[PDB]
RNA sequence: CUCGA
DNA sequence: TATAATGGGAGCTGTCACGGATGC
DNA sequence: GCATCCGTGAGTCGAGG
């Protein structure tokens, strides 16, 4: 049952959420990368906040 | 040739300016010709007035705005892919309340797109049209509660995104509830906040039967407006600290704030008319002298109770009535987006006012124009109602400008659109065409403004009627809304008149849409014309009264898809609207005043007017429209010709001497022909090709960029590696194909080289290189070539280079080259033809002339249409047309047959007798008697009861001819068709659906990034989609290997497709397929959701489909 | 979005 | 790195049938 | 045992842009 809670979040292979250069030399990318970046930023900030003894709120 | 016109109905007024719905709306929104101080509080002026002043320097106020001249002309904007627009400046002033200091400045806000003379826009080089949107008018409505019979719902609706919808209901427990933002609460509370006491409410609402008791709550009256206000703020905002000024701010912003709540002027007017009151502004209440003041609530509740009780003079509202649905035109929509952008700008302003030095603030420092420009650009580029202009022909553009959409932003989401919104309401009469609407999912949701209809200043559609007083029809015309129209008895336009007096004692009229027979005494108004019932397109179908509406819809719609031909003709049978369409679409060139033509050229006409001034009119020649059809003007005057005001100077596309020319007049026979015209297919003669009938000019645009890369620059050049002189033959010195060159699929249009990606040569390449001893070049061929199935003659080149005058490309781009390629398209097998009556079909066979059925005089027909296409379609108009055509063929004349006022059978019979005398008398004069074959056909016809037995051959042939039928000989045998055949002239158009643009095939080609499946679309050299249903078909056939092949080797199996291709080129059979890549994708994407998907064997042991590549 | 079947 | 500054601001909503917790 | 709010489906392919 506890497996319904995540401790390690899987990360999809990069080719399935590509960062590719289009005809004009510009870049196109999947939304999954922005979602993942949001996740990673918040997680890292959480680890730092815990490391610096932040309050409860 | 002579034009005879039928009909007795005299139109009192001409059609209004057909694009006025666009032009006047935008002109109203901009107010550009109005000096600033005289501007009304409407449009963008009103937007400014709503945004400013910006408070909390302390104040930033708006004085006025101005629009400058366009930095570039329209044609230049089309060329350089620029937006045709005007600079917008706003005069702002900054005031510090304490210091009293006042700084004033004119700030640049960016540009606003300008509407062209014809009602369209130029956005990034492409012509666009803002389609008008129909929506529910703001106001106060009362509808039957679908759950509780005898109970009603009151709804207060403001402008879109200008306040929430508020509902008033009488609850089963008796209390009167109010719903705002999905929050049900007792209305008594709000009534208390507004400052109503139990006394006032009792004396005001006591008349109704006990309803008022559901309004009586002691706990509400036991508290002053403030406590009630805070109570309401708690009821609407849970969690938010109930501070006084926050409650005041929220409620004011919800009900009283004119910058946030806004019934339209239309909503205000309708609320006033319905509730029998008068509004000071356009909100539901005011904030006056520290307290709130009612405006709409009490009257609405009053009406609701009155209606619930049964008090006379109170009724529910039909929401589909065109008195309750209005049109938002381009001006209003643009103004809305302008308002949004301005709001964002204001937020930015306050944000900057909080920061920075507080003494050194100028208007320029506070104002960032970017969000406004963004909102405008977003509206004109990516809004739903901003559409790529249809300009296949001028009628296309005209119709596109007069379209009305129920969809779009704030509009109806589809599939939530039931039968009601899509219905033809009775009030559509004279306002919205009942015929012209799309087939399929958009039916009833996209419509067309009726020909005489006008949108009024409030947005309601109005139609013209003639005043009738004492059975006498005046020339006084009144434009009415549907609400106004519902008051009168309105006679039909075909009511018999002697002079201006009604001549019948029984006249057909309408009363609230209901047909009724009345006396002339009862007639208050009379229709202007049958024309006013239908759109411009439907008004172009002759004998419309004989066509079933379902096919009329098709002919109507298909006129817009007609292609301009090089030898375009106006129809032999017209409705009489063909000139106004050309004129109003601004296709053709007309004389500005009286004068004499000084110069006539293919490029330009110079006219000397009466003033003595020389005016030069340049002629647009072989220009490319949005759809690639040819836009060119041909001079129709000669040197020294005397012209009057409004006379034709040049014919535009699809114009023949000022008449709308959407196609060709062809001699048709109505008969089966060896299966070649089976199921709507069409047989034509090669003679049509020989004399360039249905030949059309089309121009395609190709484009290529040379940019800077990290590996070296791309460049346009002739020095392309590994190409012969044969391949470079038509390229100029710079590497661009020459003007006049004929290009075919595979041919280079623009030479380009690109530095290769960092190449690690495989050992094979190294060995081969050693064998041939040739250094691999640094650059590779990346040239622009003609795609498969395309080509023609190069007519124009455009080159834009960085570092050159007037030129600045997007960052990194060194140069851009454009090549225009023109083709002359002859009619071919598979091209789509149509008439105005909904008869459509593709050309299935092109017959040599000797194979065509022919008249006894040796004249072959041009087109053979199948009679089986008529009975179940019920579009007999096309038959009548044909008959009249026959007459016109021999009399050398054309006809104007107005809809519902058109030529009748007897007149056509007369014309056919006249034509018969020409058709046969000539023969008898030339010294020839009746033919044996004709005698045979006459015998058969006697058996068919088509001719009276006893008469001479000539008399019988004449009878047949009067039935529109002739003797026809089979070109293959010389024997006559056993029966007489309907033959005559018909107007047929070639539609934009040409097989040349549709034929597409693919062996292998580009695949998708993630799925590794073939791309879609002809442009991407794509593959056909084998969807779920096609799969079902193969499954139902039990075609397991075919299906698996489609699933694997043919799509998304990489090893499989490679091995299959190699096997086929080796002449070996294709190998066994393996795992589709998209299944691996599925597995990985399920793993990303923390699901473990495992492929097992029969022993439940895992099988790796990733071949160890993904297992550590 | 619009068009086509 | 030091005047003092202390709770946001979006929000037009014209369908329908079912499985569901619920919750009246 | 019975009304209430929430989540979810709603034809295909093809074309343009």
DSSP B933-977: HHHHHHHHHHHTTSS-TTS-HHHHHHHHHHTTEE--B-TTTSPBP
Contact B22, B119 (CB under 8 A): yes
Cβ contact B77:B125 at 8 Å: yes
Are B292 and B251 in contact by the 8 Å Cβ rule? The answer is yes
In DSSP notation, B1048-1091 reads TTTTT-HHHHHHHHHHHHHTPPPPPP---HHHHHHHHHHHTTT-
Strand partners, B66: B89
**Inter-residue contact B531 to B16 (CB < 8 Å):** no
- Of B951, B949, B977, B975, which is closest to residue B965 (Cα–Cα)? B977
CB B878 within 8 A of CB B837: yes
Hey, CA dihedral for B16, B17, B23, B27, is it positive or negative?
Answer: negative
**In terms of Cα–Cα distance, which of B448, B489, B446 is closest to B467?**
B489
- In the three-class reduction of DSSP (H, G, I as helix; E, B as strand; rest coil), residue B308 is classed as helix
B253 touches strand D (CB under 7 A): yes
Distance (Å, rounded) from C-alpha B35 to C-alpha B65? Answer: 10
Resolution in A: 2.5
Nearest residue to B562 (alpha-carbon basis) of B392, B714, B803 = B392
Q: Distance (Å, rounded) from C-alpha B809 to C-alpha B821?
A: 24
**The nucleotide closest to B179 (CA, C1' atoms):** D13
Dihedral sign of CA atoms B280, B282, B283, B287 in order: negative
Tokens of B741: 């060159």
B135 touches strand D (CB under 7 A): yes
Query: How far is CA B1032 from each of CA B617, B1035, B1042, B1043, B1045, rounded to the nearest angstrom?
Result: 62, 5, 12, 9, 15
Could you give the CA distance from residue B935 to residue B549 in angstroms, rounded to a whole number? 41
Contact B990, B827 (CB under 8 A): yes
Round to whole Å and give the CA distance between B590 and B617.
Answer: 10
Give B358's DSSP letter: S
Write the CB contacts of B980 (distance below 8 Å, at least 6 apart in sequence).
B937, B941, B946, B960, B963, B965, B966, B967, B968
Strands B623-624 and B630-631: antiparallel
Q: What is the DSSP letter of B232?
A: H
Cα R_g (chain B), whole angstroms: 36
Written as one string, the DSSP assignment of B475-516 is EEEEEE-HHHHTTSEEE-TT--EETTEE--SSEEEEETTEEE
Q: Is the dihedral of CA B499, B500, B505, B510 positive or negative?
A: positive
Q: Calculate the dihedral angle through the C-alpha atoms of B687, B689, B691, B692, rounding to the nearest 10 degrees.
A: 160
The answer to whether B1081 and A16 have CB atoms below 8 angstroms apart is yes
User: Quick one: which H or E segment has residue B364?
Assistant: helix B363-366
Sequence-separated (6 or more) residues with CB below 8 Å from residue B541 = B547, B552, B555, B556, B575, B836, B837, B877, B899
d(CA B298, CA B782): 74
How far apart are alpha carbons B398 and B329 in whole angstroms?
A: 15
Edge-to-edge strand ranges of the sheet holding B403-405: B325-328, B132-136, B403-405, B446-448
Beta carbons of B65 and B79 less than 8 angstroms apart = no
Q: Are B256 and B193 in contact (CB under 8 A)?
A: no
Taking each helix axis as running N to C, give the angle between helix B953-962 and helix B932-943, from 0 to 180 degrees, rounded to the nearest 10: 60
**Which CATH number covers residue B810?**
2.40.50.150
> What method did the depositors use to determine the structure?
X-ray
Judge whether residue B763 contacts strand D, using its CB and a 7 Å cut-off.
no
CA gap B496, B488 in Å, rounded: 20
Write the CB contacts of B650 (distance below 8 Å, at least 6 apart in sequence).
Answer: B588, B589, B605, B617, B619, B633, B634, B635, B636, B637
First-residue to last-residue Cα distance in chain B: 88
DSSP class of residue B268 equals: H
- Strand D contacted by B164 CB (< 7 A): yes
Both tokens of B474, joined, read: 């005046």
Name which of B141, B250, B139 is nearest B190 in CA terms: B250
SS3 B816: strand
Between B43-51 and B330-354, two packed helices, what is the crossing angle to 10 degrees? 20
Rounded Cα–Cα distance for residues B925 and B920 (Å):
9
Mutate which of A5, A25, A31 to test chain B, going by most B C-beta atoms within 10 A?
A25
Residue B955 exposed, middle or buried by CB count within 10 Å (0-12, 13-18, 19+): exposed
Given the structure tokens 């990673």, which residue do they identify?
A40
Answer for the pair B810, B799: CB distance below 8 angstroms, yes or no: no
How far, in Å, CA of B183 to CA of B234, rounded? Answer: 12
- C-beta of residue B1072 within 8 angstroms of C-beta of residue B1040: no
Residue B314 region by backbone torsions, left for phi larger than 0, else alpha for psi between -120 and 50, else beta: beta
- CATH number of the domain residue B288 falls in: 3.90.1110.10
Phi first, then psi: what are they for B599, rounded to 5°?
A: -130, 140
Q: Does B707 touch chain A (CB under 8 A)?
A: yes
Taking the C1' atom of every nucleotide in all shown strands and the CA of B343, the nearest one is D10
Buried residues in B177-206 as b, exposed as e (16+ CB within 10 A): bbbbeeeebbbbbbbbbbebebeebeeebe
C-alpha–C-alpha distance, residues B1101 and B1107, integer Å: 15
B153 DSSP β-pair partners: B143, B169
Q: Which of B982, B996, B273, B293 is nearest to B696 (CA)?
A: B996
- The backbone torsions φ and ψ at residue A52, rounded to the nearest 5 degrees and listed phi first, read -105, 25
Report CA-CA distances (Å) from B223 to B196, B231, B246, B971. Answer: 11, 10, 19, 100
State how far the Cα of B662 lies from the Cα of B48, in Å rounded to an integer.
46
Environment class of B342 (CB within 10 Å of its CB; exposed 0-12, middle 13-18, buried 19+):
buried
The two three-digit tokens of residue B253, written as one number: 């912003």
Spacing of B683 CA from C5 C1' in Å: 21
Contact predicate B94/B361, CB 8 Å: yes
DSSP assignment of B605-654: EEEEETTS-EEEEE---SEE-TTSBEE--EE---TT-EE-TT-EEEE-TT
DSSP B581-616: HHHHTT-SEE-SSSEEEEEE-SSEEEEEETTS-EEE
Contacts of B150 (CB under 8 A, 6+ apart): B308
H/E run at residue B518: strand B514-518
Q: CA-based angle B359:B362:B368, to the nearest 5?
A: 125
**Of the candidates B20, B243, B22, B21, which has an alpha carbon nearest to the alpha carbon of residue B115?**
B22
Cα–Cα dist B541/B538, whole Å: 6
Question: Distance between CA B68 and CA B57 in Å, rounded?
Answer: 29
Q: Hey, what are B1029's tokens?
A: 């249903």
Contact B636, B659 (CB under 8 A): no
- Is A6 touching B (CB cutoff 8 A)? yes
| Cα–Cα dist B162/B37, whole Å | 27
CA dihedral B1053, B1058, B1064, B1066 (to 10 degrees): -150
* Contact, B407 CB vs strand C, < 7 Å: yes
Secondary structure class of B1000 (helix, strand, coil): coil
Please check whether residue A15 touches B, CB under 8 A: yes
Give the integer Cα–Cα distance in Å for B886 and B892. Answer: 10
Contact: A25, B1009; criterion CB under 8 Å? no
- Distance (Å, rounded) from C-alpha B988 to C-alpha B670? 14
Which chain A positions have a beta carbon within 8 Å of B1009's beta carbon?
18, 20
Q: Are B631 and B663 in contact (CB under 8 A)?
A: no
Write the CA distances from B355 to B92, B97, B369, B529, integer angstroms.
Answer: 19, 17, 18, 65
Dump the DSSP string for B663-681. BEEEEEEES--TTTTGGG-
Q: Is the CB of B384 under 7 A from strand C?
A: yes
Alpha helices in B723-876 (DSSP H): 725-728, 763-772
- Residue corresponding to tokens 């006894």: B856
Within 13 Å of residue B16, how many CA atoms lie on the same side as its CB? 22
Q: Which two tokens stand for residue B73?
A: 């002309």
Closest CA to B832 of B545, B1050, B1024, B554: B554
Among candidate residues B458, B398, B319, the one with its CA nearest the CA of residue B652: B398
Q: Give the rounded distance of the alpha carbon of B1007 from its chain centre.
A: 34
What are the tokens at B432?
Answer: 């919205």
Residue B750, SS3 per DSSP: strand
- From the CA of B1015, how many Å to the nearest CA of chain A? 15
Interatomic separation, CA of residue B723 and C1' of nucleotide E3, rounded (Å): 80
- Residues in chain B after which the chain is broken, C→N over 2.5 Å: 56
Cα B452 to Cα A19, B438, B528, B538, B628: the distances in Å are: 55, 21, 9, 13, 32
Tell me the C-alpha to C-alpha distance, in Å, between residue B1005 and each of B867, B1002, B1066. Answer: 45, 7, 19
Peptide bond into B53 cis (omega under 30): yes
Helix (H, G, I), strand (E, B) or coil at B21: helix
The answer to whether the CB of B234 falls within 8 A of the CB of B189 is no
Other Cβ atoms within 10 Å of B354 Cβ, number: 9
Q: CA of B46: how far to CAs of B41, B42, B65, B568, B894, in Å? A: 5, 5, 11, 48, 53
**Token duo for residue B946:** 């088509």
CA distance B179 to B1053: 57
Q: Give chain C positions with protein CB within 7 A.
A: 1-5
Beta-bridge partners for B617: B605
CB B609 within 8 A of CB B593: yes
Distance CA B958, CA B936 (A): 16
- CB B441 under 7 Å to nucleic chain E: yes
B718 CA: distance to closest CA in chain A (Å): 22
Q: How far apart are CA B971 and CA B364, in angstroms?
A: 83
**Residue B723 near residue B781 (C-beta atoms within 8 A):** yes
* Å from the B1027 CA to the E13 C1': 8
Range of the domain at B706: 695-826
B291 strand-pairing partners: B288
| Rounded-to-integer distance, Cα B479 and Cα B458, Å | 13
Q: Give the number of other Cβ atoms within 10 Å of residue B588's Cβ.
A: 23
As a residue count, chain B comes to 1112
- Say which of B707, B1009, B1085 has its CB closest to residue A25: B707
DSSP class of residue B254 equals I
| Residue B340 near residue B375 (C-beta atoms within 8 A) | yes
Task: Classify residue B902 by burial, with Cβ atoms within 10 Å: 0-12, 13-18, 19+.
Answer: buried
Closest-CA residue to B387 (of B133, B563, B632): B133
- Rounded Cα distance between B458 and B271, Å, is 13
DSSP B179: E
Rounded Cα distance, B580 and B569, in Å = 16
Pairing between β-strand B507-511 and β-strand B489-491 as defined by DSSP bridges: antiparallel
Q: Distance between CA atoms of B595 and B612, rounded to whole angstroms?
A: 9
């Amino acid at each position: 049952p506890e497996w319904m809670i995540l401790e390690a979040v899987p990360v999809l292979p990069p080719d399935l959420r590509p960062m590719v250069q289009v005809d004009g030399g510009r870049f196109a990318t999947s939304d999954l990368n922005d979602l993942y970046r949001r996740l990673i930023n918040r997680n890292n900030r959480l680890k730092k906040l815990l490391a610096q003894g932040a309050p409860e709120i | 040739m002579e034009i005879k016109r039928f009909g007795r109905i005299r139109e009192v007024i001409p059609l209004p300016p057909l694009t006025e719905i666009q032009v006047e709306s935008y002109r109203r929104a901009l107010q550009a010709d109005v000096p600033p101080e005289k501007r009304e509080n409407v449009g963008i002026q009103a937007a400014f007035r709503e945004t400013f002043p910006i408070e909390e320097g302390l104040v930033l106020d708006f004085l006025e705005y101005r629009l400058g001249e366009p930095p570039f002309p329209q044609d230049e904007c089309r060329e350089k892919d620029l937006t045709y627009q005007a600079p917008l400046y706003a005069r702002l002033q900054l005031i510090h309340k304490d210091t009293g200091l006042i700084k004033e400045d004119e700030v640049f806000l960016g540009h606003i797109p300008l509407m062209t003379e014809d009602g369209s826009f130029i956005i990034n080089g492409a012509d666009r049209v803002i389609v008008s949107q129909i929506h529910r008018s703001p106001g106060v409505y009362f509808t039957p509660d679908p759950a509780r019979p005898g109970r009603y719902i009151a709804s207060i609706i403001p402008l879109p995104k200008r306040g929430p919808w508020i509902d008033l209901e009488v609850e089963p427990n008796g209390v009167v509830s109010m719903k705002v933002n999905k929050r049900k609460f007792p209305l008594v509370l709000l009534l208390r906040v507004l400052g109503y006491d139990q006394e006032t409410l009792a004396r005001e609402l006591g008349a109704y039967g006990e309803l008022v008791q559901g309004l009586m709550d002691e706990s509400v009256f036991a508290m002053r407006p403030e406590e009630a206000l805070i109570r309401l703020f708690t009821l609407l905002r849970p969690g938010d600290p109930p501070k006084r000024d926050k409650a005041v701010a929220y409620v004011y912003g919800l009900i009283a704030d004119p910058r946030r709540y806004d019934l339209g002027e239309a909503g205000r007017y309708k609320a006033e008319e319905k509730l029998g009151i008068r509004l000071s502004g356009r909100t539901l209440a005011r904030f006056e002298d520290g307290e709130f003041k009612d405006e709409v609530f009490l009257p609405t509740l009053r009406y609701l109770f009155a209606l619930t009780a049964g008090v006379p003079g109170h009724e529910v509202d039909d929401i589909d009535h065109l008195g309750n649905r209005r049109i938002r035109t381009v001006g209003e929509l643009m103004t809305d987006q302008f308002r949004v952008g301005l709001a964002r700008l204001a937020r930015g302003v306050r944000e900057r006012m909080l920061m920075g030095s507080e003494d050194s603030l100028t208007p320029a420092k506070l104002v960032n124009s970017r969000p406004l420009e963004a909102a405008i650009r977003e509206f004109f580029s990516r809004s739903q109602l901003s559409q790529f202009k249809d300009e296949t022909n001028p009628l296309s553009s005209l119709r596109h400008k007069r379209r009305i959409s129920a969809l779009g932003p704030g509009g109806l989401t589809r599939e939530r659109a039931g039968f009601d919104v899509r219905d033809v309401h009775r009030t559509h009469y004279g306002r919205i065409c009942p015929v012209e609407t799309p087939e399929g999912a958009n039916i009833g949701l996209i419509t067309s403004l009726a020909a005489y209809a006008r949108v009024d200043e409030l947005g309601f559609i109005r139609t013209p009627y003639r005043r009738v007083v004492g059975g006498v029809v005046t020339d006084e015309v009144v434009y009415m809304t549907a609400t106004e129209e519902d008051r009168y008895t309105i006679a039909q336009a075909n009511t018999p008149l002697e002079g201006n007096r009604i001549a019948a004692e029984r006249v057909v009229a309408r009363r609230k849409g209901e047909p009724v027979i009345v006396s002339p005494e009862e007639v208050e108004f009379m229709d202007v014309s049958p024309k006013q019932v239908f759109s411009v397109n439907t008004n172009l179908i002759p004998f419309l009264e004989h066509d079933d509406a379902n096919r009329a819809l098709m002919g109507s719609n298909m006129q817009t898809q007609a292609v301009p031909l090089i030898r375009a003709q106006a129809p032999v049978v017209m409705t009489g609207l063909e000139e106004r369409v050309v004129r109003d679409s601004l296709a053709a060139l007309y004389a500005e005043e009286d004068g004499e033509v000084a110069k006539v050229d293919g490029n330009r006409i110079v006219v000397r007017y009466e003033d003595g001034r020389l005016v030069e009119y340049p002629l647009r020649r072989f220009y490319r429209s949005n759809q690639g059809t040819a836009l060119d003007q041909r001079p129709r005057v000669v040197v020294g010709q005397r012209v009057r005001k409004g006379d034709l100077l040049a014919d535009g596309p699809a114009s023949e001497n000022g008449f709308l020319a959407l196609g060709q007049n062809v001699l048709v026979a109505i008969m089966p022909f060896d299966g070649y015209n089976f199921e709507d297919a069409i047989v034509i003669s090669e003679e049509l090709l020989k004399r360039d009938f249905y030949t059309s000019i089309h121009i395609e645009r190709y484009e290529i960029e040379a940019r800077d890369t990290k590996l070296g620059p791309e460049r346009i050049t002739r020095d392309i590696p590994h190409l012969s002189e044969a391949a470079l033959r038509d390229l100029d010195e710079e590497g661009v194909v020459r003007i006049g060159a004929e290009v075919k699929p595979g041919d280079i249009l623009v030479g380009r080289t690109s530095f290769k990606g960092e190449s690690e040569p495989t050992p094979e390449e190294r060995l081969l290189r050693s064998i041939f001893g040739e250094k691999a070049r640094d650059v590779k061929d990346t040239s622009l070539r003609v795609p498969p199935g395309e080509g023609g003659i190069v007519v124009r080149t455009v080159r834009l280079r960085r570092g050159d005058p007037g030129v600045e490309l997007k960052p990194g781009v060194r140069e851009v080259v454009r090549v225009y390629v023109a083709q002359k398209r002859k009619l071919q097998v598979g091209d789509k033809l149509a008439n105005r009556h909904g008869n459509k079909g593709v050309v299935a066979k092109i017959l040599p002339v000797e194979d065509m059925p022919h008249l006894p005089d040796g004249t072959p027909v041009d087109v053979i249409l199948n009679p089986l296409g008529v009975p179940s379609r019920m579009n007999l108009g096309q038959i009548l047309e044909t008959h009249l055509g026959l007459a016109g063929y021999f009399l050398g004349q054309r006809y104007i047959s107005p809809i519902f006022d058109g030529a009748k059978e007897p007149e056509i019979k007369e014309l056919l007798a006249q034509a018969f005398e020409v058709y046969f008398g000539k023969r008898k004069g030339e010294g020839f008697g009746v033919d044996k074959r004709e005698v045979e056909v006459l015998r058969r016809a006697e058996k068919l009861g088509l001719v009276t037995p006893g008469k001479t051959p000539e008399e019988q042939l004449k009878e047949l001819f009067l039935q529109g039928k002739v003797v026809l000989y089979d070109g293959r045998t010389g024997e006559p068709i056993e029966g007489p055949i309907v033959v005559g002239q018909m107007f047929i158009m070639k539609l934009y659906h040409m097989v040349e643009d549709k034929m597409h095939a693919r062996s292998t080609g580009p695949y998708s990034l993630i799925t590794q499946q073939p791309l879609g679309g002809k442009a991407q050299f794509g593959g056909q989609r084998f969807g779920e249903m096609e799969v079902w078909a193969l499954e139902a056939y039990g075609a397991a290997h075919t299906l698996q092949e489609m699933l694997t080797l043919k799509s998304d199996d990489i090893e499989g497709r490679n091995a299959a291709y190699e096997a086929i080129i080796k002449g070996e059979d294709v190998p066994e397929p393996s795992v589709p890549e998209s299944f691996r994708v599925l597995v990985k994407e399920l793993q990303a959701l923390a699901l473990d998907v495992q492929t097992l064997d029969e022993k439940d042991n895992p099988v790796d489909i990733f071949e160890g590549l993904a297992s550590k």
